[PDB]
C-alpha cells in the first residue's frame, strides 16, 4: 500500500541523492527491533526450538537468527 511495496528503490542511473535515503537504510532495523525489544519472551522459546532440531550445530542457529526476523512483520 501507501505503506508496503514501496517503489524504493528503483535506483537506476542516479549519482545524486535519492528522495529519502537516510530513512531507508535505517527503516528496516528499527521497526523490527522495536517489536523484538518488546516481547523478548518470544525470542527465548524461539531460540530453544532451533537448538532442538537438526543437531548439526551452526545450521541450527541458521533457523533461529532467521526465525527472529520472521515474527516481525509476519
Amino acid at each position: 500500500s501507501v505503506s508496503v511495496q514501496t517503489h524504493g528503490e528503483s535506483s537506476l542511473v542516479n549519482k545524486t541523492e535519492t528522495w529519502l535515503d537516510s530513512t531507508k537504510a535505517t527503516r528496516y532495523l528499527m521497526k523490527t527491533e522495536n517489536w523484538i525489544i518488546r516481547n523478548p519472551g518470544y525470542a527465548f522459546l524461539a531460540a530453544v526450538l532451533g537448538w532442538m532440531l537438526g543437531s548439526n550445530n551452526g545450521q541450527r542457529v541458521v533457523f533461529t537468527i532467521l526465525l527472529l526476523l520472521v515474527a516481525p512483520a509476519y
Binding site: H7, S11, V13, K15, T18, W19
Partner: protein
C-alpha cells in the same frame, strides 16, 4: 558547463591511433580528454529535456464521501436494492441487521440493508508517459584556451572565444559536427534511443513535485484509479469505511488523505521539474567523438618577454591536479607562455604534463590575467614560471603516492561498473579482444542472474551473501568456487556500495 570544480571529474588518456574515441557521460560528472597534438576537451551533460507527454492513468489519493443513504428490508426479503445503484456516482454496499418485532418486522434474527453514498475526489494523482521522439540532450562542450577567473565558468564569453558550445541532440539529429573556429571542428556520434527506456517507466506527479517511477511498480498501487481521461473509477471503496450496521442508521466515513504515504512510498523516485516539460538531472548517454579537424593554434608564437605574476595562489582541484592564475606585465601579447613542471631547480626537465597545452597570451594589453592548470607528479616539485632571472617559481606539494591512486582508481571503476551495467565497458573505448568481450561477457551475465533475482532491497540481497557464505564455508573442493562466486561479490560489494 566546464569541468572546473565539478565534484566528480575524470580524465581520459588518449591512446592515439584515432581521431575518434567512445565516451559515456553522466549528469553530474564532467569528462576531460588529453591526447597528444590535440587540445584538451571538456564534455558534460547539462540536462535532459523532454517535450511532450502523455497521460496513462490517474489516481485519487484523497477523496470525499457524502450522501449516506441506506434502505432496510425485513428478514427473508432477500437482498435490498437502493436505486442509487443506477448511477456510478455512488458506491452501494448491502448489509443486514438483526430484527425484532420491536422494530418494524414480523420475524426475528436477520434482515437486509442497502447502503449507498456518493464518492468524489478531494485531490488526485496524475501519471504521465514519455515518447522517445520527444527526448533532447543539452550538451555543452569546451576546450581550454585563454581564460580568466571570471569568464571561465561563464558561458557568455566562451561563445565569443568560440572555445565552448551548446547543442541539442535527438534521434532525429543523432549526430552533429560543430565548429570551435581556430582549432577546427569535431564530431559527436551518440545514440539517443539508448539514453533511457522511455517505456521503462512513467512520469508521476503528486501535488507539485514529480517523480520517475517504474511503470511496472506503478500499476500495483492500491487506490482509486481511472481510465485515462475520464470519468469514474474502480475499486473506489478503499477510501471509505462502513461502520457497524445499526438498524436503519449506518454511517460511512472517508479515510484521511493518503498523500503522505505516497511521499513515504516514493524513495527511488528521482526529483524532476515538471511544468510543460521535464528536466532530468542524471543522464546516461553513449557517444563517440571525432577529433580530426581539431588542431593547435598558436604554434607560431614565441616566448613571452616580461615578468609574470600570481593573481590567485596555487590551489588543489581535489581530483589530483592543480590550477593557478597568472597575470602578465609585458605588452608583447599574443605570445607563447613559458611554463613547466619540474623536480628540483637543478633540473629544467619537465615531468608532469600540462592540463592545457601551450598557454596562450590573449592580447597585447598589459596586466591581463591568465588561468592555467597542470598536473604535477607525486611528492614534491616546483612550478617553473618563465626562464632567466625573471623566472619566478612556486613550490607546491602533493602527497598522492602512486599506490593509493591505483586503488582509488580500481574501486572507482568498480563503482562505475555497478549501476552502469554492460555499458560500463565503454570507458574501454576503441575496444576489441579484452574490452569488447568484457561487455559481451557482462551482457548475458548481468542481463540475467544479478538482474533476475533483482528487486532485492539492501539487506534483502545484503543478507543473502552471509547465508550464501556459509554454503561456501562448508562445501566440497571445486564445488566451493562455483558456490563461492555466488556467495561473495556481485552482492556484498553493492551492499557496501550503498553505505548510505
Amino acid at each position: 558547463f566546464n569541468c572546473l570544480g565539478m565534484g566528480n571529474r575524470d580524465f581520459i588518456e588518449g591512446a592515439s591511433g584515432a581521431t575518434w574515441v567512445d565516451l559515456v557521460l553522466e549528469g553530474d560528472s564532467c569528462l576531460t580528454i588529453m591526447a597528444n597534438d590535440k587540445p584538451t576537451l571538456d564534455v558534460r551533460m547539462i540536462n535532459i529535456e523532454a517535450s511532450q507527454l502523455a497521460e496513462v492513468r490517474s489516481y485519487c489519493y484523497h477523496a470525499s464521501v457524502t450522501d449516506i443513504s441506506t434502505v432496510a428490508r425485513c428478514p427473508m426479503t432477500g437482498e435490498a436494492h437502493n436505486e442509487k445503484r443506477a448511477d456510478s456516482s455512488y458506491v452501494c454496499k448491502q448489509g443486514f441487521t438483526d430484527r425484532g418485532w420491536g422494530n418494524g418486522c414480523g420475524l426475528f434474527g436477520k434482515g437486509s440493508i442497502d447502503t449507498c453514498a456518493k464518492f468524489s475526489c478531494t485531490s488526485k494523482a496524475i501519471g504521465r508517459t514519455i515518447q522517445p521522439e520527444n527526448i533532447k540532450y543539452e550538451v555543452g562542450i569546451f576546450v581550454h584556451g585563454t581564460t580568466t577567473s571570471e569568464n571561465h565558468g561563464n558561458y557568455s564569453a566562451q561563445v565569443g572565444a568560440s572555445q565552448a558550445a551548446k547543442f541539442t541532440v535527438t534521434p532525429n539529429a543523432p549526430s552533429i559536427t560543430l565548429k570551435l573556429g581556430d582549432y577546427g571542428e569535431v564530431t559527436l556520434d551518440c545514440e539517443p534511443r539508448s539514453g533511457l527506456n522511455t517505456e521503462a517507466f512513467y512520469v508521476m506527479t503528486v501535488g507539485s513535485k514529480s517523480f520517475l517511477v517504474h511503470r511496472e511498480w506503478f500499476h500495483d498501487l492500491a487506490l482509486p484509479w481511472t481510465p485515462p481521461s475520464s470519468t469514474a473509477w474502480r475499486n473506489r471503496e478503499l477510501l471509505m469505511e462502513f461502520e457497524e450496521a445499526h438498524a436503519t442508521k449506518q454511517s460511512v466515513v472517508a479515510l484521511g488523505s493518503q498523500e503522505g504515504g505516497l511521499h513515504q512510498a516514493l524513495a527511488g523516485a528521482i526529483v524532476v521539474e515538471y511544468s510543460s516539460s521535464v528536466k532530468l538531472t542524471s543522464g546516461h548517454l553513449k557517444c563517440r567523438l571525432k577529433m580530426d579537424k581539431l588542431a593547435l593554434k598558436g604554434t607560431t608564437y614565441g616566448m613571452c618577454t616580461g615578468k609574470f605574476s600570481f593573481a590567485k595562489n596555487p590551489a588543489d582541484t581535489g581530483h589530483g591536479t592543480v590550477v593557478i592564475e597568472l597575470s602578465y606585465s609585458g605588452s608583447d601579447g599574443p605570445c607563447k607562455i613559458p611554463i613547466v613542471s619540474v623536480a628540483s631547480l637543478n633540473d629544467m626537465t619537465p615531468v608532469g604534463r600540462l592540463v592545457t597545452v601551450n598557454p596562450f597570451v590573449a592580447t597585447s594589453s598589459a596586466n591581463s590575467k591568465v588561468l592555467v592548470e597542470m598536473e604535477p607528479p607525486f611528492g614534491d616539485s616546483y612550478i617553473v614560471v618563465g626562464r632567466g632571472d625573471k623566472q619566478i617559481n612556486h613550490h607546491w606539494h602533493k602527497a598522492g603516492s602512486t599506490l593509493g591512486k591505483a586503488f582509488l582508481t580500481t574501486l572507482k571503476g568498480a563503482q562505475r561498473l555497478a549501476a552502469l551495467g554492460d555499458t560500463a565497458w565503454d570507458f574501454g573505448s576503441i575496444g576489441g579482444v579484452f574490452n569488447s568481450i568484457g561487455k559481451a561477457v557482462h551482457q548475458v551475465f548481468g542481463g540475467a542472474f544479478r538482474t533476475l533475482f533483482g528487486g532485492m532491497s539492501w539487506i534483502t540481497q545484503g543478507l543473502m551473501g552471509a547465508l550464501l557464505l556459509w554454503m561456501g564455508v562448508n562445501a566440497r573442493d571445486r564445488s566451493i568456487a562455483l558456490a563461492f562466486l555466488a556467495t561473495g561479490g556481485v552482492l556484498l560489494f553493492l551492499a557496501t556500495n550503498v553505505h548510505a
